[PDB]
Amino acid sequence: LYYGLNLLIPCVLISALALLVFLLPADSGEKISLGITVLLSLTVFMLLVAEIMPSTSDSSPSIAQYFASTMIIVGLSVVVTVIVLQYHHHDPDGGKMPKWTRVILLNWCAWFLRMKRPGEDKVRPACQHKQRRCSLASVEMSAVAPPPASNGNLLYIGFRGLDGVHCVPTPDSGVVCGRMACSPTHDEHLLHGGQPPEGDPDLAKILEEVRYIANRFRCQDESEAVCSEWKFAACVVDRLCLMAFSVFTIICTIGILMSAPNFV
Amino acid sequence: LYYGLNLLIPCVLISALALLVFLLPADSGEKISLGITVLLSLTVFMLLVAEIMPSTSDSSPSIAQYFASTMIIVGLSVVVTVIVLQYHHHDPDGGKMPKWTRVILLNWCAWFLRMKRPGEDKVRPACQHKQRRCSLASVEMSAVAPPPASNGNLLYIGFRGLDGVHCVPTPDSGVVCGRMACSPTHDEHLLHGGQPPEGDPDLAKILEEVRYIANRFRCQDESEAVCSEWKFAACVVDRLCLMAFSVFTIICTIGILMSAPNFV
Amino acid sequence: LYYGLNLLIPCVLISALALLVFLLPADSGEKISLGITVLLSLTVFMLLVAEIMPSTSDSSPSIAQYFASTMIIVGLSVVVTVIVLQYHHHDPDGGKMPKWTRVILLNWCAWFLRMKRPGEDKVRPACQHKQRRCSLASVEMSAVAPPPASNGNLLYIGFRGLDGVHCVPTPDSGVVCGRMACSPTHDEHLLHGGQPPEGDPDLAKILEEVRYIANRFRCQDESEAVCSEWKFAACVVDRLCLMAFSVFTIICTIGILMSAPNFV
Amino acid sequence: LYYGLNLLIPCVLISALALLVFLLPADSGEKISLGITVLLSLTVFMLLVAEIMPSTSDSSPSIAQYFASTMIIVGLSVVVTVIVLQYHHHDPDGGKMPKWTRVILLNWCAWFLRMKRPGEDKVRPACQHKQRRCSLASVEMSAVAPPPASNGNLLYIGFRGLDGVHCVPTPDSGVVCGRMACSPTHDEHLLHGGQPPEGDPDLAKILEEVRYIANRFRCQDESEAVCSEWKFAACVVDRLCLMAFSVFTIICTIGILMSAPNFV
Amino acid sequence: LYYGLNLLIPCVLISALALLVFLLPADSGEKISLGITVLLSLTVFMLLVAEIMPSTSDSSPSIAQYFASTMIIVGLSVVVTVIVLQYHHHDPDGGKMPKWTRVILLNWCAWFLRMKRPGEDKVRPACQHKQRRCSLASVEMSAVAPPPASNGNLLYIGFRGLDGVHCVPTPDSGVVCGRMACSPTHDEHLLHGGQPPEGDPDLAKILEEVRYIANRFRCQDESEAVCSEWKFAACVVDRLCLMAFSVFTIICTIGILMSAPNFV
């Protein structure tokens, strides 16, 4: 009665912790260590195995096969932890070349947020009207800008979209000579009470330095955004590995349960 | 004499450390590891158990049941540690969907600060006057703004409450044409000593860039505030788990004490 | 000859490391783990004890009592480590209510810097003149401001002391109409070369935003100062616990030494 | 059947983790610990060896030689981990004197990005035209500035290249007296509507302080860049050590496989 | 053949790692733990010793003395690690009073950079001319300012040297009334085109707030500089301890080698 419980509780707990390690968010600070830490908890347990199946007295290959399979599984998990952490730095050494895994990471992120399976993708409010049709705004295979949206598309084309209307307004809109809203129509005599349009050119340099420091801060902001994106990609890969290993763990448990009468 | 002490001191110390781990604040840096670290301290101790109850010589299911229960308890604690840490990042992968646990976290935070049990909620200075009544300022089921307070309500409606009087003063107050306090009454001839009301439009752009960098800093401030809120939620969940497991640990100790004569 | 040395060196080293852990500064990042790490170093050592005093072959309660006492001491130390770390975050959950331990922490900090024992408090340069007397500047039981000093009192009453002379100069000093030092005496005709006293009101808004960002930075400065104060309080509590446990460790060592002939 | 598997799976897993540790990016926070952590996982395993080859009962030098070789390999790896981490701080104590390893690190970084082996260096689009020739812009043995490029050469000569045309425009270009583009040709009567060219000298001091704080921020930016360069150098050295130890591990595995029939 | 190798390789590896731990830079984050981590690697190894020299079967004081010496050495190293880390925070509790170890740390830093031994101090380019003589600029026993240099002396006397010529130019230089270089000679009629010398006093307040935030940033810069100095001092003390323990380790190895025939 105590043998089965003492052999099942620790193994089941270790198998559950192995999955919980990946279920944890992308904590690059501790993950790389946590994945190994759990492994240590198994090594000590291996000693107890020597009591029930010594390496020179008892010959029980049945449970030894399952133990070796679990050891290989945890080793592969610890190894893939390093590959996952690799996506957090992207050192210049190379390896995981960019422009290849980004399309897969974006697809995974879109499938996690917007479910794709028939349970929620097909069974949902839909119609055959223009609300689900496609046009020049959807089919952008020719490198067309995205539609105007507040999720990072309206201000994107403006700020990040260099050479656009916000920075290069070459299209003749007629505001410089047709409208007077904050734009005098070819008014060359508009003087600031007898002075030029600018009180002191030093203000221009002050504004330039202010914009320079603002861009310096935006550089760190973009670095933090890239770090967050790398963390999200690592978490997505961890979730994928968890989903993949879930089936293997379930199969191993089913085999150990169905093969228990053969040994016990 | 030495057997009972040697079997009680380590188990009691481990049971106390298991609770102290949750009693620790929400230290995401070490908590995720600490919860596992303590577990290691038990694994080695398990070896000592093999001396008193070998897995193939002695059959003592009485204490084995309690040992397995303690192992399952610590495993569940380590597993819930990961669920708690999950509330610290809220990755885009999903899982703990927001807008559901926030109402429970706020309720727990309000109950911890403002006690709700009869010991302090009912036995306190109270009266049947307007000080405890309700009005349009308390019953805000129609999405009404909170009362004016300095705890994050007076400046909230002003700054975060867009489209309000601070940004969209559409209500005709009469200050633009009835009062002269920092608001000339339709005075179109008010010139800055012969110059327009503004010395140089470049100052407007300088102020705009200053406000832009101020908003950039406020973004990081809000990120830090959200991180602190997530840490507080994790600490609240840890305290809840501690309170829940306290009864289980007390019951286990009472059972081990009352069942000691059966084994010893 | 080897038995006594092998039993004394590890125990003495562990007892010294237990105290050195608290002697370490308030390193919240590693302390919480360090206190537990040392504990692990003892668990393995316990295995060696099983060789000299098996749990079912040898009955030696003499040294077993001291071993259990040391185990309880290290467990209490590890437990108090969590209480110490609790003073580093002060989560909204409650527990260590403020306004109670602050007066004790300040007293401990003043006693550590300014020694209070007769060895250095009484034996020091002193006299019965006004240098050691008290007046309205020392007896501030009526919530009086502290004396003017550069240790955080001169600028404190100025900046942090709202409603004072620096922000609300209600006392009629006579500088607005009696002195002309940076204060024209009721000079309403003082114009900036024909212009108002201010060139552009936009400069006022620029200065206001500059002061706003300065206050935003001062907020983080105050947060860091509070964190440093919490770290100092944790270090003070650690030093107090070290001083308390020093006597217990000395008594345990004296007992083990005087009781050695009984066992050895 | 179980003996060979139980002796091969753990050893192979440890050998793979030893290489994966170096395959991990330059994580100075955990690397220094990770390299040692894996070592611990071997120590416990050594205990199991005592079951198959006790230190006083069985004499099997064949596998003992391979075990000692693996132990020495992991020890050398752990030792070189410290030398790698040394490149992350470069303390004033000395040791790894600069100006010597920089030329090797740059060469390694250029070889990793731009492959040098014949597989990709020689087999690639090339021609005997000027596209592959050399001139005064390529042969810069006389300390000549690099060609103008956007990879850190166009703005480098401008900002970091003190005493240049951007800061010391001594070459007579003729813009001060030949061109009027933002440079009045010796126009001494150009007044800002009756005022000097500058409205207020205080703006000059404001711009000077703005540039001072910008340089203060650039100092931290350069510190972060140097830290990133040190991390990249550490990662390059780790990859080099990995490539070096790969051949040794392969040779050890081949020897253990070919020498298995002698022992088994 | 296997006994000697199995007893020498682990001990030698541990002795080398003990020194490599100190050879590592002053990593306060991991050092405090690393020093203890290595210790754990020894505890497990101690178990193996019980196989060759049980605590109740074999009496071998020869190697037991060396084992106890190594244990005491590693314990003293771990203890001194805490004293080294103490120099990283300098808590208000006291202990290592400043103004005493600073002169020793500076001397050690100067001896490490500028070698003092005859191998490099005496054997170097030197002469008996004024290049090696002393004058009022070298003998500064009367608290004289250091010579003008770019290593932190030219700008030091200017910025940090309050009450100097940069802030208190009391010496009558004659520039206020003798030179017109950015200093009108008692020109009271110099008006900014009919306006006072300053366009708007608000610019003075803006510059004052800019300087205030610059000083706030300089405060954090000085804090980081002090932290770096403390880290350098800790690294210097670690190197000193390494050099001290090198002789002890060499003596222990020589003794173990010369005393091997007595035991083996």
Short mmCIF file of N, CA, C and O in Angstrom, two decimals, chain A residues 30, chain B residues 27 29-31 33-34, chain C residues 26-34 85 88, chain E residues 28-30 32:
data_model
loop_
_atom_site.label_atom_id
_atom_site.label_comp_id
_atom_site.label_asym_id
_atom_site.label_seq_id
_atom_site.Cartn_x
_atom_site.Cartn_y
_atom_site.Cartn_z
N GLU A 30 15.13 33.94 -13.57
CA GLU A 30 15.07 32.70 -12.80
C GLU A 30 14.77 31.47 -13.63
O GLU A 30 15.16 30.37 -13.24
N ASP B 27 7.95 38.81 -3.65
CA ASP B 27 9.29 38.97 -4.21
C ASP B 27 9.40 38.05 -5.41
O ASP B 27 9.88 36.91 -5.31
N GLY B 29 11.40 37.98 -7.71
CA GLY B 29 12.76 37.60 -8.06
C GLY B 29 13.21 36.31 -7.40
O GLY B 29 13.86 35.48 -8.03
N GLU B 30 12.86 36.13 -6.13
CA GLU B 30 13.29 34.97 -5.36
C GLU B 30 12.16 34.02 -5.00
O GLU B 30 12.40 32.83 -4.82
N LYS B 31 10.92 34.52 -4.89
CA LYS B 31 9.80 33.68 -4.48
C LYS B 31 9.72 32.42 -5.34
O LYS B 31 9.72 31.30 -4.82
N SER B 33 11.80 30.86 -6.86
CA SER B 33 12.86 29.92 -6.50
C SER B 33 12.71 29.45 -5.06
O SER B 33 12.88 28.26 -4.78
N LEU B 34 12.40 30.36 -4.14
CA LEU B 34 12.29 30.00 -2.73
C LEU B 34 11.31 28.85 -2.54
O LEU B 34 11.62 27.86 -1.86
N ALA C 26 21.77 44.32 4.59
CA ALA C 26 20.40 43.99 4.21
C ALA C 26 20.33 43.85 2.70
O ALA C 26 19.93 44.75 1.96
N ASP C 27 20.73 42.67 2.22
CA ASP C 27 20.68 42.33 0.80
C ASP C 27 19.40 41.54 0.55
O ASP C 27 19.40 40.31 0.57
N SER C 28 18.31 42.27 0.32
CA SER C 28 17.01 41.62 0.13
C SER C 28 17.04 40.65 -1.05
O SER C 28 16.25 39.70 -1.09
N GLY C 29 17.92 40.88 -2.02
CA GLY C 29 17.95 40.02 -3.20
C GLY C 29 18.43 38.61 -2.88
O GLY C 29 17.88 37.63 -3.40
N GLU C 30 19.45 38.49 -2.04
CA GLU C 30 20.04 37.19 -1.72
C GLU C 30 19.81 36.75 -0.28
O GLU C 30 19.80 35.54 -0.02
N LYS C 31 19.61 37.69 0.65
CA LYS C 31 19.44 37.33 2.05
C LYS C 31 18.36 36.26 2.22
O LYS C 31 18.61 35.20 2.81
N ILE C 32 17.16 36.54 1.71
CA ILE C 32 16.05 35.60 1.86
C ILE C 32 16.46 34.20 1.42
O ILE C 32 16.02 33.20 1.99
N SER C 33 17.31 34.12 0.39
CA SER C 33 17.79 32.82 -0.07
C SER C 33 18.98 32.35 0.77
O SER C 33 19.05 31.17 1.14
N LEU C 34 19.91 33.25 1.07
CA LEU C 34 21.11 32.87 1.82
C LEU C 34 20.74 32.19 3.13
O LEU C 34 21.25 31.10 3.44
N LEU C 85 12.63 40.67 6.16
CA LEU C 85 12.36 41.03 4.77
C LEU C 85 11.01 41.71 4.61
O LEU C 85 10.82 42.52 3.70
N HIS C 88 10.87 45.37 4.15
CA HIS C 88 11.45 45.92 2.94
C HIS C 88 10.41 46.33 1.91
O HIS C 88 10.73 47.11 1.00
N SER E 28 28.43 41.50 -6.39
CA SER E 28 27.70 41.43 -5.13
C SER E 28 26.41 40.63 -5.26
O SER E 28 25.92 40.07 -4.27
N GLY E 29 25.84 40.56 -6.47
CA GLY E 29 24.59 39.85 -6.64
C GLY E 29 24.72 38.35 -6.45
O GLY E 29 23.86 37.71 -5.84
N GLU E 30 25.80 37.77 -6.98
CA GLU E 30 26.01 36.32 -6.92
C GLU E 30 27.16 35.90 -6.03
O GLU E 30 27.15 34.78 -5.51
N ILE E 32 28.13 36.61 -2.93
CA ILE E 32 27.70 36.19 -1.60
C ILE E 32 27.11 34.78 -1.64
O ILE E 32 27.28 34.00 -0.69
#
